[PDB]
Structures are given as structure tokens and as C-alpha cells.
Design a protein around this ligand. Structure first.
Ligand SMILES: *[C@@H]1O[C@H](CO)[C@@H](O[C@@H]2O[C@H](CO)[C@@H](O)[C@H](O)[C@H]2NC(C)=O)[C@H](O)[C@H]1NC(C)=O
Ligand SMILES: *[C@@H]1O[C@H](CO)[C@@H](O)[C@H](O)[C@H]1NC(C)=O
Ligand SMILES: *[C@@H]1O[C@H](CO)[C@@H](O)[C@H](O)[C@H]1NC(C)=O
Ligand SMILES: *[C@@H]1O[C@H](CO)[C@@H](O)[C@H](O)[C@H]1NC(C)=O
Ligand SMILES: *[C@@H]1O[C@H](CO)[C@@H](O)[C@H](O)[C@H]1NC(C)=O
Ligand SMILES: *[C@@H]1O[C@H](CO)[C@@H](O)[C@H](O)[C@H]1NC(C)=O
Ligand SMILES: *[C@@H]1O[C@H](CO)[C@@H](O)[C@H](O)[C@H]1NC(C)=O
Ligand SMILES: *[C@@H]1O[C@H](CO)[C@@H](O)[C@H](O)[C@H]1NC(C)=O
Ligand SMILES: *[C@@H]1O[C@H](CO)[C@@H](O)[C@H](O)[C@H]1NC(C)=O
Ligand SMILES: *[C@@H]1O[C@H](CO)[C@@H](O)[C@H](O)[C@H]1NC(C)=O
Ligand SMILES: *[C@@H]1O[C@H](CO)[C@@H](O)[C@H](O)[C@H]1NC(C)=O
Ligand SMILES: *[C@@H]1O[C@H](CO)[C@@H](O)[C@H](O)[C@H]1NC(C)=O
Ligand SMILES: *[C@@H]1O[C@H](CO)[C@@H](O)[C@H](O)[C@H]1NC(C)=O
Ligand SMILES: *[C@@H]1O[C@H](CO)[C@@H](O)[C@H](O)[C@H]1NC(C)=O
Ligand SMILES: *[C@@H]1O[C@H](CO)[C@@H](O)[C@H](O)[C@H]1NC(C)=O
Ligand SMILES: *[C@@H]1O[C@H](CO)[C@@H](O)[C@H](O)[C@H]1NC(C)=O
Ligand SMILES: *[C@@H]1O[C@H](CO)[C@@H](O)[C@H](O)[C@H]1NC(C)=O
Lengths: 134, 453, 134, 134, 48
């Protein structure tokens, strides 16, 4: 079910995964047309929609430095750690929201980015270079 | 058994504050008033407001720590400043004016205060100078000591005339959310203002808000839902204001009856000053009528909502203002171009029993008129309101109130709610209480069973 | 044959497909150097070349949400509909321009984007997730 | 070894290849927050960080038009020419810096981009289209 | 120096140890705020 933009904010993470393109398509293009030339009021909203694309490109750089690159669902090779949210499957995807999920991960979220940027492409690329000659 | 996996486009938002947009309402091209409030820059409205209710979503709102109100305040201030920048300056008007009372002080028990001033102003050329007249109105000095006079506006800041081509009619301006961000709108009828909204929707563009500068009384505001709302950042603290939102609008009809005229006297090579001409016909003070039955019902409905906070079967009172600034002690607003300062001393004389209170078809309120305003927080500029040629009559819906409680050890006794105001932001919290700005963070992680290569 | 930028605007779609990089490389970088600091005239052209990259990123988002992602030629899995331009092969690629093609498709073009964004990755990704565990 | 940003500027090209993400992550996001609204001084630095992303997108277009596309290490199918730096292996990656390398290539660097943009995707894509039907 | 041989080019000198300097305007001065124009106000050097 669609339910439009952010419709599954309180639904399960599994049901919320069914609407990734919906949340993705409405964040980048909130296009205001600034054809009228008004002096001091344009710089504020221009800075706003420029910092918007700066944050978007920061997220895209983070999603490119990883083995994942497709702006979609993707799998990695970094194992999940039992210290992070000691929960089984179906307990997460059927009785939890992405908000509470990021809240519980926020304690251990900072090292996961490092494990994804270094334990992967800093070694996966090097293995790709030393295993593509044969 | 299970590995980390990323998901892009997840419904995750975090509360933040960023620059917003503004709407052109789409009727801006057909107004053709050259420049209204925000007709300058805002973009036309989308054909369909994307209002999407988010089921199972409860979001904690806090209207008193909101940043949209600060954005709208700074935007209104810059609007005033950029609207008055290219208009006619009137710095040579700060001269000596030999004035005289009006020729009709009939029955001096009633008041009549318009000064037939005349003064030597600069003309088209710089060599010669010409004597003109007719500045009028109450705001002036008492002179240092036909009686001499001068402008206290000159005693404070510089003066500039408002452009006669622009208008002050509030166009419906609703803020919009940029790319990457969204606006959560609460939907339940009764809202505490601070707390968890159980019925939340999301939008980009808000609902139409009319920028109205008003004190003591909120005009052309958004009606409440089924119940009168009594909002406050801290109800125990006396210093914090008390905002009141009405269920039913209170009809008000304000009138400047002086069938007035104007005079365009040329000053400088390009400028031209609009002076208040002679009053053709009879004269009487401007006023505002409110139907007494509707006001009685509104007060009797608000007192029961106040008793929920300050006790059942108790008495509350409210007299007129305490004292201080003219803009704080008087219901000040604009209409047609003329700035009305009315005294609400005739509406707040009430004590309330547990069931009743302690004909008259309508209640009238006297109102003085002011053309030079120092309401700008920049005390380096003031605006001269151009005179309006003709009679003025403007109707409006009263929708809100701003009250202050008398402090002290008044527990065993009764409580008093005198009118007040001052801060412009309180005028905006009656419209942005249901709105919160959030930023989208669509990068999530979760464990599932899968393997690469 | 090259014939430079837009050289094959009136040629066949097949011959025009031989010059995709030519039309692609000259649309993104029409770089003006705005080192001189001139007040009111910079905001207009700055808004222009910012809306340019906004439109470019809208096109890139549309080309990323689809199964296609390489900024090149690409094939999909959405079948062509006989209602859309009832024509055979070689009739299109050897006696038709891209202008007239988009003109004839403009009647049915709006639903093709939806068939490419929903009938593909809203199901192709989900099949990829449920077929990568074995 | 990391040695931070640009730490391997004087080291060998092989050792410098171990820190690609380090030089990549600090060039795109030098984010200044321009919330204060100051008139004539914002346009200069705004033009600066806009030309920054323009140059970044020029580099990304150059890295997309080629057969390479992953913002990482990548191999092509264009043969190395003996006229370009008449040197053997291990002589380059163990006694040379990227600065001196680009200096020696600067004489022949301009044609390599053309050999990568035309001798590859102007023929590799066409071969991909005529070999994906079976 | 950009060119030590050329006389016209300046010679910059940077110290190792800082040289202490103490500057004093001893006139216990006062000011006068005379009003000029509708908003402006000029600050004049009062009597010493
Ligand atoms: C404010 O003005 C309106 C319109 O002039 C008044 O509405 C009228 O009220 C009278 C008396 O009830 C009716 O006979 C008219 O038919 C009404 N006209 C309209 C257009 O509604 C209203 O009563 C005035 N309010 C006050 C407090 O004076
Ligand atoms: C999990 O994290 C802890 C501390 O962060 C670490 O000691 C342990 O080795 C990790 N285990 C796995 C399997 O990642
Ligand atoms: C969902 O339900 C299970 C079992 O009832 C429980 O263990 C789990 O903690 C619940 N999820 C959350 C987020 O509380
Ligand atoms: C006439 O003007 C003088 C000016 O000082 C004022 O004090 C007085 O009240 C006026 N009388 C009227 C308006 O009847
Ligand atoms: C004007 O006011 C004066 C008081 O200052 C009063 O004596 C006089 O009757 C009034 N009317 C006229 C016409 O002068
Ligand atoms: C005001 O005084 C002028 C003389 O300067 C006179 O011409 C005019 O009629 C007077 N107006 C009134 C209302 O007394
Ligand atoms: C509303 O919020 C205030 C916050 O202090 C709280 O004290 C109060 O109990 C809440 N409810 C009502 C009905 O005021
Ligand atoms: C106002 O006065 C002018 C001039 O005497 C007159 O023509 C006009 O009719 C008056 N206004 C009305 C509503 O009658
Ligand atoms: C309030 O009413 C009193 C009389 O009850 C009056 O003297 C006073 O001027 C009025 N206004 C204020 C601000 O007190
Ligand atoms: C207002 O309502 C009270 C309570 O019923 C009543 O006593 C009073 O006469 C009313 N005032 C009017 C009708 O003017
Ligand atoms: C409110 O709306 C009315 C429309 O009837 C308009 O005449 C008036 O100018 C608006 N503003 C105020 C402050 O009354
Ligand atoms: C006042 O409220 C009524 C009730 O909906 C509405 O019909 C009318 O247009 C409103 N007038 C103004 C000026 O807001
Ligand atoms: C073609 O389109 C029509 C209407 O748009 C639809 O009814 C039909 O099922 C489509 N067929 C195919 C094969 O897509
Ligand atoms: C190209 O020629 C064929 C056969 O002569 C014809 O059927 C087709 O309609 C032509 N193309 C266009 C676009 O007219
Ligand atoms: C190397 O370059 C020269 C001149 O640039 C050219 O003649 C030769 O064919 C090239 N050889 C290879 C293998 O690319
Ligand atoms: C590195 O050393 C080798 C052998 O000593 C030499 O041939 C080569 O030119 C050196 N590299 C540079 C850049 O000089
Ligand atoms: C400067 O002069 C004033 C006025 O005589 C005096 O109060 C003050 O003490 C003097 N300054 C010092 C440092 O004594």
C-alpha cells in the first residue's frame, strides 16, 4: 500500500521498505521557481536549497564509498554484531519502526559507518585488483 | 546468519530548523496592486495541496520553541524595510509648525483634537520655499516654552512616506517546505499546544495565513475546532502571555467616518508629499462596533475554559489595560491604509459568578488615528501613512485574545486577565501552533539474510 | 559521423544514437566564470545555472529509480505496447527523427515512466532480495 | 598507513593508492554554514563552493562517460602505449610519485582521455547492444 | 624581500622577541551628543 509520502512512518520496517521510492522522490525536487529577481530574500532560500543538495551529495558520497552504490535496497558483506540490538529476525521487521530502530542503533551507529567504509572497500577493492588478473 | 543491509528512502525524520518558502496564492496577477505584502517574490500555489495523513504516527509538538515563528517575524520585518526603502523620504518635513485647534470644538466636554498646522516647506526648486498647511491629528509635541508645534517622530528617528501605490491588504501567504524537508500538521480538534499530536498529517505548503499586525485582538485569524483554546508556555508564570483562540468569530465593524481628501504638494525634483486635506462635511471620531450579544456569549464561553485551569465555581475578573506604550495599551491595527488605535476600556468590565455575570444592541469603542508609526524595531526609521481619500469602513472577524494575569498572592481571591501584547511573535503562534518543520534522513540499516558475490 | 553538437537532429534515430556522448557532454558544462563580483546581475544567471543542475539531477533521479542506471544505452524488462506507435522495426530507426518520435509518444508518454518506475524496481528489487539468499 | 589527508603525496603511487577514500572524502564536503544573511560577502564564497561542485560534476561526467563508473579503482580495455612513459612495472609503483607521474604524462595526457571516451563506450556500448539479443 | 638588490622594493622584518610598547592618550576626555536630523546624533569631543 502506498499511503503517499511518509505514509509508513509508524508501520513496520518491512511494510515501510515497500515505499522507498516514495520517500526518495519527494526529497530532492521541491523545486521553487525563482524567476522574479528580488534582492535580499533570494539568498536565504537559495542557501537553503543549496545546503539541501550539499547534504544530499554527502549522503550520496557515503552511499558510494560503500560496496553498495545502487540507490535501492542493497546487501553488504559486513556481519551484523550481536551487541547491536540483541534481537532475532521477524522481531525487528514486524514489531518496530525505523524511528525506534535508529534510536536503538544511535548508541552503536557511529562505528557501523566505519565498518562499512573501511572493512569493505579498503579491502574489497584491493582484493578485486589482485583477483582480476587471472 | 544475518548481515547488515542499507535502505534508502525510509520514513525517518528529525526535527530541525531551516529556511522556508512562501506562496503567491495564484491570485497575485489579477490583483495588480504593483506590490502587496509578499506579492513581490513568492511563487504561485500548487494546484492540489498534498495533505497526507500519517496513520499510527504520534508526534511531539511544541509551539513555544518553534522556529517558524522567528522566520515569519524576520520575514515581516524585512518586508517592511524593503517596502519602505525606495519610497519618498520626508526628512525636510521636520520643521516648526504654527498650528491651531480645529474650528469645531462644539461642546468642549467632548474631545476634538486635529491641529490646522501651517509651515514653510521646501518646494520643487531649492531657491524658493513655499508655505503649506494641513498636517492635522493628535500626534505632536506641546512645543518648547496659533501655537508652535513640531513632530516627536523627529524627536526620535528619521521619517519616510509609505508609497501610495502599494497596499496593506493582507494577501493569504502560506509558507512552503523546500526539498528534503516536510511540515507536520496536527489534526485533532483539541490541542494542548505542547505535547504529542495523535493525528498527524504532512505537507509541503501550509494553509493560507493572512499577515495581520494587531494587538489585544486577533483579526482575520484561523478559527479553533469546536472548543475555545487557552494556550500558554507556562500557565503558572504570570509574566508569560495567555493566548486565546475562539470557536465562533466575533463580528467587528470599524469606521473612519471623515469623508477625507488629499493634497499632492511637490517637494524636491521627483518626490511628492501627500498631505491630509481639509475635512469636507461634519467631523466625528473613528470608532468600532461589536455586537453585545456575540461578545457576551464569547466571554461566557471563554470563562468556562478558564475555570478548567483556575478552579471550578470560582470568580474571575478583567479590567482594562494597566499602562505603558500606546501600541500595548490599545487595540492597534490597520485598515484601508489608516492605522486605528482603539481603546478596549469599554469591553473589559466584568465579574463572573458560577452561572451568570454582574439590552444595548451594540457596544461602540472610540478609536484615535495615527499616521506616523515607530513600530519598527529599528528605531532609526519611521513610516508616514498616506491619507485615504474618502470614508473608511472595514469589517473583520475577531478570533483571538492576548491576556496577562495579575501576579501576587491572589489564590484565595480572584484572578484578573488584563489585555496586553507587544511581541509580534504572539500574533503568529495562533497560526503556526499546528506546524512543525522536519528534515528527512532516508538512510537506514537493518539485518537480513543475504550474501554478495 | 560526428557533425558536432546536435548534428543528427534531423537524421534517423539509429544514426542519432551514434552521437549520444556528444549531446551529453555539452549540456552539463557551459561553465561561466563568475569571479567578478557584480551585485544584482549575478543572481539571475546563478539561478539559471542552478536550475540547470536541478533539472539535470531530476533527470538523473528518473534514470536512477529505473533498472537502467548507466548514463548510456540500456535495456529494460518492460514490454513495448502495440498501442504505442503501431509500427514495426526498421520503420522507426530508418525513417523517423527523435522529435517526431517524442511527438507521437507524447500522447502515451506519461504512463511509460510509471511502468518503468513501478513495474520494474518496485518488483525487481524485491525479487532480488528474495532470490539472493540461496 | 593513513597519515591523514594527502599524507602520501611524496610516497610511491602504490602506497598512495592505499588512501584513495581519504583524499576523496575531504574534497567534496568542506561545508560552511551560511545561515547569517550578509549581503555582498556571501556571493563570492557561494560562487566558490558552486564552482567547486561544478568541477566535481565535470570530473564525475568524465568518470561516467568511460567504461569505468565506480568511484574507486577500475580497469579498462584500452592498452597502454609504449610511447607513454617508456617504463616497466614496479619501476612506476615503487619509485615515483603521482605528481611526477602526471608531469611526465602531461605531454601525452590529452589524447588518453579521447582514447578512453571514444575507443571504449562509443564501441563497447554498441557491441553490448548487438550482443545482448541472443 | 621580493628582490633585495632593487631599492624600490620594501624590506620586511619579522622579530624573534616581541618589543614591548605602551601607548597612552592621557586626556581624560568627555563627549557631547548633539542631535542633528530626525534620527542622527553627532558625537563631539567635549571639553578636556
Ligand atoms: C457589521 O456590518 C454588517 C454588514 O453591514 C452587519 O450585518 C448586517 O446586520 C443587519 C442587522 O442584523 C442586517 O439587517 C443585515 O442584513 C446584515 N448585512 C449583512 C451583509 O450581513 C452587522 O450587523 C454589523 N455588525 C455590527 C456589530 O455592527
Ligand atoms: C561487536 O562489537 C564489539 C565491541 O564493539 C567487538 O568487541 C566485537 O568484536 C564485535 N563483534 C563482531 C562479530 O563484530
Ligand atoms: C514487539 O513484540 C515482541 C514480542 O511481543 C517484543 O519482544 C518486542 O520488544 C516488541 N518490539 C518493541 C519495539 O517493543
Ligand atoms: C486648543 O489647543 C491647545 C494647545 O495647547 C490645547 O491645550 C487645548 O486643549 C485646545 N482646546 C480645544 C481643542 O478645545
Ligand atoms: C474651541 O475650543 C475653545 C477652548 O480652547 C473653546 O473656548 C471654543 O468654544 C471652541 N470652539 C470654537 C469655535 O472656538
Ligand atoms: C486651516 O488654515 C488655513 C490657513 O492656513 C485655511 O485656509 C483653512 O481653511 C483652515 N482650515 C480649517 C478647517 O480651519
Ligand atoms: C498541557 O501542557 C502543560 C505543559 O506544562 C501541562 O502542564 C498540562 O497538564 C497539559 N494539559 C493541559 C490540559 O493543560
Ligand atoms: C464625500 O464627499 C464628496 C465631496 O463632497 C462627495 O462627492 C461624495 O459623495 C461624499 N461621499 C459620499 C459617500 O457621498
Ligand atoms: C482604564 O479605565 C480607567 C477608569 O476605570 C481610566 O482611568 C484609565 O485611563 C483606563 N486606561 C488605563 C490604561 O488604565
Ligand atoms: C450578558 O449576559 C448576562 C448573563 O446572562 C446578562 O445578565 C446580561 O444582561 C447580558 N448583557 C446584555 C444582554 O447586554
Ligand atoms: C480582514 O478581512 C476584511 C475582509 O472583510 C478586510 O476588509 C480587512 O482589511 C482585513 N484586515 C483587517 C485588519 O481587518
Ligand atoms: C468570518 O467568518 C465567517 C464564518 O466562516 C466567514 O464566512 C467570513 O468570510 C469571515 N470573514 C472574514 C473577514 O474573515
Ligand atoms: C497497452 O495499453 C493499454 C491501455 O493503455 C492496456 O489496456 C494494455 O493492457 C497494454 N498492453 C500491454 C502489453 O502493455
Ligand atoms: C517512413 O517510410 C515508411 C514507408 O515509406 C512509412 O510507412 C513511414 O510512415 C515513414 N515514416 C514517417 C515518420 O512518416
Ligand atoms: C601510440 O601512440 C602513437 C602516437 O601517439 C601511435 O602512432 C601508436 O599507434 C600508438 N600505439 C598504441 C599501441 O596505442
Ligand atoms: C627509480 O629508480 C630506478 C632505478 O634506480 C630509476 O630507473 C627510475 O628512473 C627512478 N624513478 C625516477 C622517477 O627517477
Ligand atoms: C576622569 O574624570 C572624571 C570626571 O572628573 C573623574 O570622575 C574620573 O575619576 C577621572 N578618571 C580617573 C581614572 O580618575
Amino acid at each position: 500500500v502506498f499511503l503517499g509520502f511518509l505514509g509508513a512512518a509508524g508501520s513496520t520496517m518491512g511494510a515501510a521498505s515497500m515505499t522507498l521510492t516514495v520517500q526518495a522522490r519527494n526529497l530532492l525536487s521541491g523545486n521553487p521557481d525563482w524567476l522574479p529577481d528580488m534582492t535580499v530574500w533570494g539568498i536565504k532560500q537559495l542557501q537553503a536549497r543549496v545546503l539541501a543538495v550539499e547534504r544530499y551529495l554527502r549522503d550520496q558520497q557515503l552511499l558510494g564509498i560503500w560496496g553498495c552504490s545502487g540507490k535501492l535496497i542493497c546487501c553488504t558483506n559486513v556481519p551484523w554484531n550481536s551487541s547491536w540490538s540483541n534481537r532475532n529476525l521477524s522481531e525487528i521487521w514486524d514489531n518496530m519502526t525505523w524511528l525506534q530502530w535508529d534510536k536503538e542503533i544511535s548508541n552503536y551507529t557511529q562505528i557501523i559507518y566505519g565498518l562499512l567504509e573501511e572493512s569493505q572497500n579498503q579491502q574489497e577493492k584491493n582484493e578485486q585488483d589482485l583477483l582480476a588478473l587471472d | 546468519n544475518l548481515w547488515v543491509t542499507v535502505y534508502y528512502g525510509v520514513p525517518v525524520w528529525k526535527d530541525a530548523e531551516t529556511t522556508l518558502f512562501c506562496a503567491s496564492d495564484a491570485k497575485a496577477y489579477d490583483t495588480e496592486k504593483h506590490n502587496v505584502w509578499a506579492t513581490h517574490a513568492c511563487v504561485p500555489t500548487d494546484p492540489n495541496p498534498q495533505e497526507i495523513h500519517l496513520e499510527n504516527v504520534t508526534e511531539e509538538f511544541n509551539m513555544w520553541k518553534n522556529n517558524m515563528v522567528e522566520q515569519m517575524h524576520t520575514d515581516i520585518i524585512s518586508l517592511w524595510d524593503q517596502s519602505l526603502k525606495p519610497c519618498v523620504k520626508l526628512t525636510p518635513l521636520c520643521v516648526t509648525l504654527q498650528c491651531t485647534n480645529v474650528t469645531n470644538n462644539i461642546t468642549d466636554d467632548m474631545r476634538g483634537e486635529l491641529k490646522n498646522c501651517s509651515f514653510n516647506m521646501t518646494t520643487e526648486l531649492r531657491d524658493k520655499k513655499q508655505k503649506v498647511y494641513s498636517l492635522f491629528y493628535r500626534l505632536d509635541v506641546v512645543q518648547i516654552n496659533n501655537k508652535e508645534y513640531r513632530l516627536i517622530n523627529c524627536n526620535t528617528s528619521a521619517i519616510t512616506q509609505a508609497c501610495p501605490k502599494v497596499s496593506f491588504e493582507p494577501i493569504p501567504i502560506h509558507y512552503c517546505a523546500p526539498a528534503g524537508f516536510a511540515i507536520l500538521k496536527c489534526k485533532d480538534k483539541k490541542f494542548n499546544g505542547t505535547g504529542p499530536c495523535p493525528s498527524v498529517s504532512t505537507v509541503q505548503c501550509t494553509h493560507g495565513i493572512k499577515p495581520v499586525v494587531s494587538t489585544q485582538l486577533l483579526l482575520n485569524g484561523s478559527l479553533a475546532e469546536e472548543e475555545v483554546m487557552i494556550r500558554s508556555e507556562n500557565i503558572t508564570n504570570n509574566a508569560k502571555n495567555i493566548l486565546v483562540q475562539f470557536n465562533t468569530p466575533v463580528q467587528i465593524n470599524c469606521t473612519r467616518p471623515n469623508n477625507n481628501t488629499r493634497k499632492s504638494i511637490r517637494i524636491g525634483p521627483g518626490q511628492a508629499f501627500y498631505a491630509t486635506g481639509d475635512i469636507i462635511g461634519d467631523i466625528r471620531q473613528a470608532h468600532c462596533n461589536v455586537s453585545k450579544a456575540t461578545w457576551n456569549e464569547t466571554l461566557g464561553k471563554v470563562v468556562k475554559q478558564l475555570r478548567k485551569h483556575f478552579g471550578n465555581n470560582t470568580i474571575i475578573r478583567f479590567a482594562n489595560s494597566s499602562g505603558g506604550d500606546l501600541e500595548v495599551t490599545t487595540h492597534s491595527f490597520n485598515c484601508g491604509g489608516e492605522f486605528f488605535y482603539c481603546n478596549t476600556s469599554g469591553l473589559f468590565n466584568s465579574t463572573w459568578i458560577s452561572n451568570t455575570s454582574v439590552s444595548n444592541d451594540s457596544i461602540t469603542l472610540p478609536c484615535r488615528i495615527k499616521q506616523i508609526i515607530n513600530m519598527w524595531q529599528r528605531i532609526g526609521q519611521a513610516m508616514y501613512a498616506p491619507p485615504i481619500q474618502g470614508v473608511i469602513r472595514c469589517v473583520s472577524n475577531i478570533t483571538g485574545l492576548i491576556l496577562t494575569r495579575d501576579g501576587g498572592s491572589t489564590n484565595s481571591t480572584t484572578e484578573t486577565f488584563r489585555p496586553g501584547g507587544g511581541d509580534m511573535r504572539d500574533n503568529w503562534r495562533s497560526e503556526l501552533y499546528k506546524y512543525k518543520v522536519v528534515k528527512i534522513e532516508p538512510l537506514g540499516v537493518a539485518p537480513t539474510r543475504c550474501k554478495r558475490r
